[PDB]
């Protein structure tokens, strides 16, 4: 299989870039992020032309790339969404997991 990609996978599709890692979400199910679409599962980029490319930000619906990265009220687990569940009420983590500034995502 293609397995997980290398590390240092960052995405600069917005004025605020982010750096993701697969060696960190190893315990996380691939289907947890790479939600199934059409019933098929594949390893593609969220910001794929035709997937999450709304560049609206202020939309929060689905196409909102910046919505599937923060918005928690989504049909699927969101970055911050899951993070919120992970960090929960542990403090510090929610500042480096769901933190707006000075976090693991945004620095
Ligand atoms: C606190 C609730 C947060 C605020 C406010 C913002 N973020 Fe994030 N963020 C993350 C990713 C993966 C991206 C996309 C990277 C890319 O492709 O460019 C973003 C993007 C943004 C943006 C850009 C939208 C714009 O054009 O203004 C803004 C304004 C923004 N974020 C604000 C990832 C994460 C993340 C990882 C779990 C966290 C905790 C946050 N973002 C939290 C906030
Ligand atoms: C969220 C916690 C994720 C989990 C769990 C896994 N992946 Fe992932 N992967 C994620 C993102 C956000 C991205 C793209 C970054 C973006 O800007 O959206 C990726 C990318 C990949 C890719 C690259 C796409 C390609 O060109 O093929 C591959 C191959 C990939 N991911 C594989 C993969 C595997 C094998 C996973 C389980 C072992 C897995 N991912 C989990 C987010 C997340
Ligand atoms: C195209 C093949 C996609 C890729 C690659 C990813 N997503 Fe996606 N996602 C896609 C669609 C078409 C939809 C909505 C269904 C529709 O037709 O409208 C979604 C939805 C989400 C959601 C839910 C948002 C909500 O319900 O509020 C989330 C949280 C989400 N997607 C996240 C996400 C992540 C993290 C991805 C990379 C790991 C990713 N998506 C890739 C289409 C596609
Ligand atoms: C649960 C389904 C998750 C989803 C969806 C996303 N992440 Fe995550 N993340 C998760 C856990 C359990 C942890 C461990 C906490 C730790 O910091 O060790 C993390 C951690 C991160 C980190 C920090 C660690 C690192 O790898 O540098 C970052 C920067 C991070 N996560 C980013 C991230 C992004 C951008 C996501 C959406 C594309 C995302 N995570 C999804 C659990 C889950």
Structural domains for the chain: 1-107 (3.90.10.10)
Does 30 appear as a known binding residue? yes
63 lines ligand 4 (CB under 6 A): no
Which residues fall within 8 angstroms of residue 8, CB to CB, at 6 or more apart?
19, 21
Give me 31's structure tokens: 């289907």
Strand, coil or helix: what is 85? helix
Report CA(37)–ligand 1 centroid distance (Å).
23
Q: Does residue 83 contact residue 95 with C-beta atoms inside 8 Å? A: no
Q: Of 11, 42, 6, nearest to 23 (Cα)?
A: 6
Residue 67 marked in a binding site: no
For ligand 1, atom 33, name the residue with the nearest CA.
105
Contact 84, 94 (CB under 8 A): yes
Is the distance from the beta carbon of residue 34 to the nearest atom of ligand 3 less than 6 Å?
yes
Q: Is 51 annotated as a binding residue?
A: yes
Q: Smallest Cα–Cα separation from 25: which of 40, 5, 45?
A: 5
């Amino acid at each position: 299989a293609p397995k997980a990609p290398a590390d240092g996978l960052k995405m600069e599709a917005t004025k605020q870039p982010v750096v993701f890692n697969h060696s960190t979400h190893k315990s996380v199910k691939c289907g947890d992020c790479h939600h199934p679409v059409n019933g098929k599962e594949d390893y593609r980029k969220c910001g794929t032309a035709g997937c999450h490319d709304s560049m609206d930000k202020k939309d929060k619906s689905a196409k909102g790339y910046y919505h599937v990265m923060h918005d928690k009220n989504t049909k699927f687990k969101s970055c911050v969404g899951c993070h919120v569940e992970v960090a929960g009420a542990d403090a510090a983590k929610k500042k480096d997991l769901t933190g707006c500034k000075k976090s693991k995502c945004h620095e």
